[PDB]
């Protein structure tokens, strides 16, 4: 549980010395990671669904929830009940396993890595990756199929300030 | 002058008794026109009056109409026995009760304002008087 331990001792030390909190329970943590795939090509063909559904499972080690429309639109021909692919929620040791399997592994597999954004916080201390090349996870085996689909990751935290978000993510290893 | 859209084109024709629910105290400008009597006022009358004032005054001048004809009114086709529904629309009216300010004007002296609003008063079905602001 290397990264839990890392966070608890070293990063907590650094960050509370930095921000001068009155207690540890002020310190921000991560409540969840949320993956999304968000694909409207299933109006066309539903094989698309089961494909990305399987790849999400392969990545996160757990089956994904299928998201569904709630309202209908005529441009995309999207209607209440037709799924738009899937999400996943992750919290626990799965959270940290996924964090590391990004930072140590696949974000170095970026083709052109100029750090990563300093702006992509909503304004509460909570971050998104809009990922392009979904096969930078190993287990896809992208010979069989080539629609990467991209992906969205959403890290969610108990921080107030985007500053604290940046600094905690820095202590994780994210630019 | 019309509304762009209304829910019910065939309304009841409004009440004329009483006095103003508001629009009595001159607000925007310096001078105004105040009804002493009750009648209806139309798009046509308003256009005419506003034209009259804006011609009597040079480009130096500012006008605020203070009423709008929300309420439509009907008239039947010609040479038609009574009944058989309710007629089409032929106009739009603002009701006016005594007290209410019809026009307000700012960018001039009181003599010019008096003459302009005098010229306009003759193009409405209503007796008017000339108003200045209060304390």
């Amino acid at each position: 549980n290397r990264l839990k331990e890392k966070f608890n001792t070293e990063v907590t030390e650094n960050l509370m010395k930095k921000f001068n909190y009155s207690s540890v329970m002020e310190v921000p943590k991560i409540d969840k990671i949320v993956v999304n795939m968000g694909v409207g090509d299933a109006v066309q063909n539903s094989k698309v669904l089961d494909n990305a559904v399987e790849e999400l499972e392969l990545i996160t080690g757990q089956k994904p929830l299928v998201t569904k429309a709630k309202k209908s639109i005529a441009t995309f021909r999207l209607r209440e009940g037709m799924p738009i692919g899937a999400k996943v929620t992750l919290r626990g040791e799965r959270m940290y396993e996924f964090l590391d399997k990004l930072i140590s592994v696949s974000l170095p597999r970026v083709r052109d890595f100029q750090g990563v954004s300093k702006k992509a916080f909503d304004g509460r201390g909570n971050y998104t990756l809009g990922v392009k090349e979904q096969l930078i996870f190993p287990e896809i085996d992208y010979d069989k199929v080539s629609k990467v689909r991209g992906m969205d990751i959403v890290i969610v935290t108990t921080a107030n300030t985007d500053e604290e978000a940046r600094e905690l993510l820095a202590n994780f290893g994210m630019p | 002058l019309l509304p762009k859209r209304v829910k019910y084109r065939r309304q009841h024709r409004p009440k004329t008794t009483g006095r103003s629910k508001g629009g009595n105290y001159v607000t925007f400008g310096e001078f105004g026109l105040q009804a002493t009597t009750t009648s209806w006022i139309t798009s046509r009358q308003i256009e005419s009056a506003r034209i009259a004032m804006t011609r009597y005054m040079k480009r130096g001048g500012k006008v605020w109409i203070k009423i709008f004809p929300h309420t439509p009114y009907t008239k039947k086709p010609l040479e038609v026995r009574m009944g058989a529904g309710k007629g089409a629309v032929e106009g739009w009216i603002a009701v006016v009760k005594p007290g209410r300010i019809l026009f307000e004007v700012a960018g001039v002296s009181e003599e010019v304002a008096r003459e302009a609003l005098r010229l306009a008063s003759h193009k409405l079905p209503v007796k008017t008087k000339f108003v200045k602001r209060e304390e």
Partner: protein, 118 residues
């Protein structure tokens, strides 16, 4: 993130239960309150707001080191003994806005088994 008050969602549920069940002297209701440490319990008529009995897992000879569900069972026995005297044979169980699976269920079974038969 804003964290959520379990007590408040519970009480919002409690009200929906209490819309139906109210109690009376003929049969009062068995108030139940839970906490991460231990349980409090009352038996009350709500025509007058007059708690007819009480027992708690806090201040008693019931208090022991096991905050196990058995301590809930003993709260049940305690209100059973302390209430059967006062002429209370039947009652309306209050779920409390909790769920009837654990400590709540254990207290209820205890009270049933201790003569305070619903």
């Amino acid at each position: 993130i804003s964290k959520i008050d379990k007590n408040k969602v519970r009480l919002k549920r409690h009200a929906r239960v209490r819309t139906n069940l109210s109690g009376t002297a003929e049969k009062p209701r068995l108030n139940v309150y839970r906490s991460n440490k231990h349980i409090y319990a009352q038996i009350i008529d709500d025509n007058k707001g007059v708690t007819l009995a009480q027992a708690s897992s806090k201040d008693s000879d019931i208090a022991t080191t096991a905050t196990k569900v058995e301590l809930a069972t003993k709260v049940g026995e305690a209100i059973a003994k302390k209430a059967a005297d006062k002429g209370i044979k039947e009652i309306v169980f209050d779920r409390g806005g909790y769920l009837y699976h654990g400590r709540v269920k254990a207290l209820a079974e205890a009270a049933r088994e201790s003569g305070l038969e619903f």
